[PDB]
Symmetry: D2
Subunit: 212 residues, 4 copies
């Protein structure tokens, strides 16, 4: 596509997109075009508005485009073209990516006892309500545990909420503790969001006992 | 995929899918699995049910799966595996395709006068509310008009309703009437549904006058 | 989207799209934009060309866009904007839909004997190499057989070729012949293409014997 | 979906997926099923193989599934079900995610001079050949620069190679340097892969002069 301003918009929240170059108040020669999950290719929106699109995205007095409550289908591209009172045309180009933050992740079915030298189920980490899916990962004593290295194995599951579309992730950790190791290790699980710069979320630790 | 029974399900209507081989009433060893626009790959549904899926698809006393109001995202594959009281396992495999019937098509901006030997805009046909999109076509004196043959031009547009997903189609017809032709031709437009065996819908005719 | 000329382009064949309004030969102020399965949103192509796109779509001396061999990923929208020597701007807007014609359909595993009053497997119809998928249907004595009416049942299967993407369809017909019926019925199967105005293809008939 | 082992497979490289529980050499009662970008829902692959799938994915003597050169369309789910010589059934479930590493990122059009207190174009960072797309970000003196905080502006562009599908990313940085700031700041750009635990790639720094 073209160069654009990246916009990250949280599901359910309003979004206001600026029409660069527009007169501050009507009358305004401006047009918005958007290609999102709602549209077949580009849809043009005008200041007068009208129709079912009024429920979804409407042009404000100052020419900005307003969505009262962003949803997954609003992901896409939003563009404005305006003329000011002199006649200079100005373009605005936005790439809108939608997200939701899940609840704090939780560990379920955690083991209280591990045996060294054999594979053990440590626990299952669960995260509910993310978009995009994101990923879960495990840590041992503040260091990331890497699947398929050093007796670590992980299995993963992804489900979607049937009405909201939001993701639930599950991650099952097994480890083979090394003989003569730490007898009270500390494990935890973290959720890493899909979009850049969004913060990770972490579970409470679990501290099994390891038997030599 | 595998062999399946094709099911066509109208948007907004209920759908009941039979679990072949299931005992007529509980207790029943049966499981439904579905992969639709709602799911990440396969989702398993059990007779006890539970959770958010209860709002969408639930197993009936006789083991059938019930959706109170089908939507676009229920398109996909629905399977049942049952054991009867003896131990015979029986599979059910359904490919569910969703549709909606648009309103009767309408011609707008129809021409009252055509000039022979030059291109004329005859009219614009509009169909609102279909799924899948379907197509519009034009007829002249009960015979199909073929675009880019014999001085016929057609342009087409597709839009989607922002909340329902249903399609609105527009088709603009231009013709160059042949000299010495019928002076009161009869044009009409038809909507052809996307799914097989669904009936076409037709507009009222228009009867312009052609000037030699 | 906007009004456009519909273009149907057969896979593997060349496609030439006209840039309306362009000067017949260089120099030409024209630009092509396309959004297809190959692109992230819109890609701009210029007369000078250059790069990997030269292998796929290149601007001709007369300003038309040339694709030497259309593929499934060329489905999408293709637009031109040209200025003539005076300064009139002219737009060209094309919606390109790709297709392939399968081989003639064939019936396999046809039954030689049917018993009246009980369900019988009549045969399996197979079509290989279509795009879009299209559909198969059955006929009895030159009339369409409707699944789930009058002792008819059909099961269907769709597969894709792993490298070409083209569809293979299979359709299994079972019928319960009515007692005292025609003792040498004639069945056949037809492939119906997905795009409008494309012709159906039909199998050779089969003529089982029916036993009262 | 179900619990699965996550597999990350580099485009163009071979992939071997183990059929857990299978006998070490024929005869083997095992079956692979896969749902990927190549398939319409599930495709079953058998030890005898055969057909066009032999070019893509074939079962080895030890029952593993072998793809000689993974492509984007092999993303998806791969399952095995085996019985050993005793009769024990064993399942294998793999979620295969494909990737490619881009070339080292490069800064182009870098500025030699910045003026403090006014917006300046610092440069454009480009990354070629990634899958999935991944993201670019900017750093100032070893700290991440956050768009739309403290006089920082970023615009982004994504394109796809028309034949390979791989992504090229561009990121244009503008900054308003703070008065009385460091007169020789150090900027750099980093590519962050889409999949977890894959390493970032970083550009050589640029060191413009800032004029008070
Ligand atoms: O679900 C729904 O129904 C729904 C959705 C969104 C929504 O919020 C809004 C979102 C955007 C904008 C607004 C104000 O728009 C207005 C109100 C009054 C005049 C105008 C308008 C102005 C001018 O602005 O003076 N110049 C114009 C020039 C040409 C044509 C129209 C205008 C715009 C309200 C409200 C309801
Ligand atoms: O911060 C920003 O907003 C921003 C960031 C980067 C940026 O680079 C670009 C420079 C030139 C072109 C482009 C893509 O084409 C664009 C972008 C925006 C509006 C339009 C546009 C055009 C028309 O042009 O025909 N008609 C329109 C009618 C209605 C609404 C929009 C348009 C086309 C992108 C432009 C703005
Ligand atoms: O507005 C909408 O679209 C919407 C409407 C309703 C809604 O909740 C439902 C969702 C799905 C299906 C249904 C009903 O089928 C149902 C639902 C629940 C139980 C039964 C049922 C009854 C009995 O009913 O006595 N005995 C049972 C015994 C065994 C198993 C089931 C039942 C039948 C209700 C969710 C959304
Ligand atoms: O009219 C019909 O319903 C019908 C039409 C054609 C037809 O051909 C087929 C024959 C065999 C297999 C298939 C696909 O696999 C299927 C089909 C249905 C259920 C299952 C299944 C299996 C499991 O098998 O492991 N576990 C399950 C657990 C829960 C729910 C379903 C299944 C697998 C299709 C079968 C039924
Ligand atoms: O796979 C591949 O590599 C491949 C793909 C497609 C292909 O066929 C073609 C497809 C389209 C066009 C052509 C001629 O283009 C040409 C040849 C010579 C000059 C120009 C050209 C002309 C002018 O035309 O005089 N004015 C121009 C004005 C500005 C910039 C360039 C030109 C165009 C060849 C050939 C190879
Ligand atoms: O037969 C036909 O070709 C045809 C059929 C219907 C038809 O209706 C339309 C009327 C107006 C607008 C539209 C969509 O927008 C279009 C259509 C075509 C080119 C452009 C365009 C614009 C720009 O406009 O900024 N810049 C461009 C730069 C490069 C290449 C194309 C464009 C925009 C469609 C137009 C032509
Ligand atoms: O350019 C490409 O991407 C491309 C490359 C190669 C190609 O054909 C192949 C496709 C998939 C896999 C392979 C090999 O694994 C294979 C293939 C065939 C047989 C065997 C094999 C051998 C034995 O080999 O002795 N004994 C066997 C005994 C039992 C089962 C298999 C084998 C191993 C070859 C298709 C495309
Ligand atoms: O490390 C691993 O491999 C692994 C990780 C997690 C894991 O959890 C699961 C436990 C049970 C079920 C599942 C999903 O269903 C699966 C998984 C694998 C094969 C099958 C399967 C079935 C059939 O079952 O009818 N027929 C088949 C025929 C051919 C090929 C595969 C199957 C079904 C997942 C299983 C294995
Ligand atoms: Cl799910
Ligand atoms: Cl639309
Ligand atoms: Cl397939
Ligand atoms: Cl692109």
């Amino acid at each position: 596509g073209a160069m654009a301003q990246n916009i990250t918009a949280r599901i359910g929240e309003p979004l206001v997109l600026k029409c660069k170059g527009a007169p501050k108040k009507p009358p305004q020669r401006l047009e918005w075009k958007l290609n999102t999950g709602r549209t077949e290719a580009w849809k043009v929106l005008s200041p007068q508005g009208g129709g079912p699109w009024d429920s979804v995205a409407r042009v404000l007095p100052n020419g900005s485009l307003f969505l009262p409550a962003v949803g997954i289908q609003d992901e896409g591209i939003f563009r404005c073209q305006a003329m000011n009172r002199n006649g200079k045309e100005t373009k605005s180009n936005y790439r809108v990516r939608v997200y939701q933050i899940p609840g704090k992740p939780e560990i379920v079915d955690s083991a209280s006892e591990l045996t060294a030298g054999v594979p053990n189920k440590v626990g299952t980490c669960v995260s509910e309500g993310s978009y995009p899916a994101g990923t879960l990962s495990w840590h041992l004593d503040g260091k990331p545990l890497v699947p398929n290295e050093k007796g670590v194995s992980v299995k993963e599951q992804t489900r979607r909420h049937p009405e909201t579309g939001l993701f639930t992730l599950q991650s099952e950790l097994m480890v083979t503790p090394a003989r003569g190791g730490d007898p009270r290790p500390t494990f935890s699980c973290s959720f890493s969001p899909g979009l850049p710069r969004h913060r990770a979320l972490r579970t409470a630790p679990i501290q099994p006992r390891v038997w030599e």
